[PDB]
Amino acid sequence: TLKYICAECSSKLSLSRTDAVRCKDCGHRILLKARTKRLVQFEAR
Amino acid sequence: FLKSFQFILKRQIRWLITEMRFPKEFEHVAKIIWLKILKTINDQPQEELKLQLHMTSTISILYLASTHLSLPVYTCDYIKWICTAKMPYFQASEILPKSWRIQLPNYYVSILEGSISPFNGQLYNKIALTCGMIHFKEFFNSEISCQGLLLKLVMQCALPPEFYFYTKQVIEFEETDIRNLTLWERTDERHTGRVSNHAELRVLSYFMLTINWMLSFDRDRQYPLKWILSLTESLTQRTTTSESIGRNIVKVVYPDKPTSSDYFQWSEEETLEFLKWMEKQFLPTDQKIARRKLYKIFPLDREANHDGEFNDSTHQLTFIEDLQERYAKQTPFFPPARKEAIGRLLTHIASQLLVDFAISKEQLKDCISRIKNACLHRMN
């Protein structure tokens, strides 16, 4: 289950098609994408 | 329309099997009655067929299934289970379809939801049509169980049970082919018959004339005038059972008649259980944050120390025990002023009976005129 985060009230929030791009608890518009469990790799340098 | 109307009919029967405990044969009886009216829609000229369905008709083919199984439910216990919103009648479209709602036309869904209650005998006339639309006669056994109707109307108003047999001797007088108070069929015209042809209705004016003639021509001086005033005020008295408070809901809905704005004379406790009923009205009935915040400032509960767990054993008593208050009230059992007190009871027994059966004052007044004037035309 992919989700997002409201930038204002910090509530985790998934979003579907035919939805207003808003938070659903506060009415905030700016709504940043959370990070999920996914493999990236690095040299330890 | 039909795929959803049957589904609202299916959900109304599925309530009665679960909660009012009508048996699992009652589900089958209604399907033939639904299939015989569904075959009726077939036979019409299908272009501008103008099919006749209403929400009054989902009670009828639920009442046509009631007397064929010969159940002691009556139309007083259909006008009550809808007005207290127990089975899906009012707002029958608000929760049921969930997809068919938006792809149905507006006119077909306002009919399909319970916008009004049936009033002034609108419920019987739909039965009289539906008994003519399908042939309920000579395919089913239209014998109305009128004996419990006398028994319930004994228990309605807490009279001695001699009235049960003072009535049934009158019924066995004024009836052609003494038994068989049959449900009336009408398929010929659009005129509602001014006979009061409905056999379930004729029991009332039988019971209204029985309760008068035993008390007016009281030759035995058996029923004293001290008892009459101890019967009227025992009956004209407000109690807080589960069954009378549901009858307070029915007095709310019907606006024309007097004793419809009767809620001013309620008590404290009769209002709390009405508001405790109100938690069964709201369940049938992006800037939603305003109501989300207003319901937070007005929480629906009691704000502290509620009435669920640590309340009592019993405050609210059942239908059997307020009778035992009414019966133990009318202990004295051993004239121009007598008949004035007779009409105290007759008025209070009939105005009680007028809201419980959804008819006008003249709908019952005409039924006195087609019984009393037919009882003496057959006598003399």
Place this chain on the structure above:
Amino acid sequence: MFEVPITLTNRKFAQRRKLKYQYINYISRRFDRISKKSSDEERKFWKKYEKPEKSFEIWRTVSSQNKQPINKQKMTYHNFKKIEKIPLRKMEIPLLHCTKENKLYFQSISRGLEPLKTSTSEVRNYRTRHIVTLTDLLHLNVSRHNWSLAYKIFATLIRIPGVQIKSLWGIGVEILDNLSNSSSGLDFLQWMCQIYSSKSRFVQNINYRSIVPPFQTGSRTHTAKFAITYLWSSLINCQKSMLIDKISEWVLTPPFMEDAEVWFIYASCHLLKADTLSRQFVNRDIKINQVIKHIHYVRTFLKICLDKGGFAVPSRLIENQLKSFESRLY
């Protein structure tokens, strides 16, 4: 008995109000020529009068330049039967399109004979029929000094779909008079002024149905009745909870340049602030010139209270409230 918060709409009421103001229009223009010699039909009607939008009735001061002589040109019976027959000769031809009870209604109301049936009393909608039941028990138990039961009614009233701003804020004295599990009574008027803050001009041409200005909406040139109730509340609630600078900033941010009651409450904020600090606990550098500002705002906000419209302050006594306050300063 009481007023219901329902937008109730039926063709039979929309017939008899359309039939009435149509007949009103013809006898108006017929009278427009008789006194001279000696397309909704209701949207046209209200273009003549002024809807008050502050009050239910557009009141006037009288001993002023609203004077007018007595029009001693009266009406008599001959002049009235001739000025009504030409409307009714043209009014009878739409009377074949209406329902018979309205043709029964329109004849009787044309000769006096006010109606006796209330418009909410034959609705039989089953949902309005419990709204009429709940509001008549709500105003009854507010009247019957019974606040825990009127709250249960009011919480179950706002949850029915369709209710309006009539019942909403006025008899929200229940939280104000509960005071046990209270939401303070001021969290609700802050809710009312957050979502009903309206600044659209009052258009006055559209027929208003079910929303009415002088107690529940808030347009330009008319502060909302709950807005100035919120300001008188949160100043007494500020005083009784002795925070004064919070309301002294929240009133600062709107310049309502129209009404003066919002300026007097502003003037009264600094007055109560200068009242409280004028004790000084002597029995002293900044506490002298801190009070002298709040004396000065009261003298500049009461002055701009008086340049606006009618809000009669007792300006004489307020100057004596402050002239005693500098004596504590001295």
Place this chain on the structure above:
Amino acid sequence: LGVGVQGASLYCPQENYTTKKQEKPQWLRPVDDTLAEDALDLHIVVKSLLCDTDAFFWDPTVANRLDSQYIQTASDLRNYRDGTEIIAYASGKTGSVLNLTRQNTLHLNRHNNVTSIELHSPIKSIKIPGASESIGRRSNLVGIITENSFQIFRIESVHSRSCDVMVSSSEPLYFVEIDDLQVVDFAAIIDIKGNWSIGRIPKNFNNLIDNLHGTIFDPEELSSWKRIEWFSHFQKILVFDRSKMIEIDFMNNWQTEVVQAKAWSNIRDYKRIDDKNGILLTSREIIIVGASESNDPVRRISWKHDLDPDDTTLRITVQKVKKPDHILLVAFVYSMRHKRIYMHVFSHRKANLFQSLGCSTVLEIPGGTPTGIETILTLDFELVVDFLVKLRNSSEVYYYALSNTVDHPEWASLFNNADEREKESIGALVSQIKLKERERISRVQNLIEHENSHDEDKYLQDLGYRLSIATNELLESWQKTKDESIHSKLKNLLENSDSFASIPEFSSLLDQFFQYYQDQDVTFIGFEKLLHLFLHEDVPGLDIFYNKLLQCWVLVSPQAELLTKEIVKDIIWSLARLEKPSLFEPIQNEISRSLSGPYQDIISSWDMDD
């Protein structure tokens, strides 16, 4: 003098708050909130009786058909005896005639002598205005309005030995102008439908309108409510409709529209308080107590309160209650559709500083609605008030005192005809059940004499064997009439079926007979899961169905027993619908009706989805 006014208007509505404060830092509630504090104020009636005697609309012109006020005739002027209260009401066949002291309750005089003068028109408006308190006297004359004329009477020289009220009259001025007139005031000042006039009252009753007048005719005011009152005795009048209030000085040329109430409200009622400054106005949606200006007595718009009801037939009465520091005003609005009253408490003080307290409401007697409520002045925090009501469509005037601490003819006329031939004819069918119940009080008592008998156990064994052969006759008649695809009696036996009075042992006939059919061709309904429809509770057993009914008619019947036996027997032989066929019958029928409908109704004939 508080602060929150508009000048042109001045409010204090339904318990939001006040709109004022002065912030008086004096440790004495530093606020002059327009809503004073005290505890509750309840009103209890003290009921009495004083005396007595298309329909979708109502008439605005008929206002009061009774009156009662302290009056002062010419003899009590000269004499030191002063102060008598009379009652002038209407009566007659169509209500066409015109006609006292309180000992401990208010009642009609001991001599009970009404001076019933009679008129040749229905009586419509009965009122006196009364007089001012700075004139030294009270009025002695009443004015009435009828459909033919306009008459002024005068009470002259009330008596003590005979309680005799002899009157005079003024001459009845008819319709010179042919339009119905509405309201009289004195303080011959009349208001016709549109135009008003001033008259000169004579002092000789043994042998008219003055020559100055005006109108308020608005063409688009379809109601017929007109109204006139002088304002503070300064020859300034206030003329009304349901749309606007006009102030007219007839002494100059001066006329001004003060109120204009077209947009959302309308002016309902207007009663002139005997305080010559403060006068209460009833609009719809608001109660206004609009007083007089200090400088020039024209009209001041003072502290008003939001009226929560909404109706077209509301009136008002107001009564002053003079108290030591202050003056009270209660304001009773009443309606012709119901019985509820609605009040407020205002408190007038010295510097025209006056306030509000709240609201309360009390009921009446349930037959009729108030067409008239009238208070009693009583010659002049334990809030007391008295008044007398008069209900619509009844002509009995009662008496009430509020302190701080039905057989309709419509049900009776349907019966009871005066046929001497058919008098005993109704009693003849009564006489049938005079006997036949005494038969069945002993026909069943015989069965009470046999309790668990071997003669009744033989009879059930005769019963259930008579239920048996008719059963296998009935089912096999259905087996040959099975394939029809186009009914349950258990009353096939006919001898008695009722010579057995043992209700639990009848269940042993009833339970055993059901076990004998384990295979198909018959179905049976229940009697414990289905008998709960009567007692409106959980009824697990049919014996305790009987046992809670037997303990329900203990007091009402002589010995109460065999009735309770054979009601239950009459139920089960009415709830004997036990012969519905089994799984083969309706399922082959429900498929049979599904075929005659096309493919269109097949998918529309489908349960079992959610």
Place this chain on the structure above:
Amino acid sequence: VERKVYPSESRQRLTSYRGKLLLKLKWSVNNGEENLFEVRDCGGLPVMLQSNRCHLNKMSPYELVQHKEESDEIGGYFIVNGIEKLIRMLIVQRRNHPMAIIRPSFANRGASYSHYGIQIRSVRPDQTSQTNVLHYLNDGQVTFRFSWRKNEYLVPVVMILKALCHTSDRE
């Protein structure tokens, strides 16, 4: 619902941090017998950070942290379409003091103009400037220069001086 926008929201949106400009008119016809007062919405002009009209005005370093700013947020700049811009200060002539400039490009203006001249920069109480140069011609004539719209107008000095007040020629 009316909400309270903070400048961290206006950077994420990449919009301006605008505050609404209101402006009430006076439609006076026939010299004040009839007036009309209309408060007109004139758009939203952008607002300098931590000024009066910012929401970060009277605010603590603890609250600047909670409202998504640095704890020592300095302000003094506008946010215009996401980009933070500021009005550069300038160096102009000191107000209200007649300077005594000589300048070679006054004889490049006309005939017989000297290079001599007095220049004053007069500011109004609403901080609006007005510069008046006072030339010297080689005739002995002295003129008075100003710029009204973008044009440049010259008048003799005794036409001003005898219009300012009632002057005897010896005064």
Place this chain on the structure above:
DNA sequence: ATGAAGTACCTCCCAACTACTTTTCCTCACACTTGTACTCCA
């Protein structure tokens, strides 16, 4: 009687609020006539 020219004030923008028809419905009354149910005048 034109070749050029600044101003002809056009346009070139949507949405939201709150009202008013608009879409077929379904419900019936509202009441007609000759016989059915009695009493005046031979």
Place this chain on the structure above:
DNA sequence: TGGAGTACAAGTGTGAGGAAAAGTAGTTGGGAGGTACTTCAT
């Protein structure tokens, strides 16, 4: 006991009156910069 007018049982033709939910017609609160036009003085 026979001969005619009105009281009422008993069966039958006309549209009209009444609901709610999609869809719609006016005043408003929400924003972008040149293009296009028909003349008139020399």
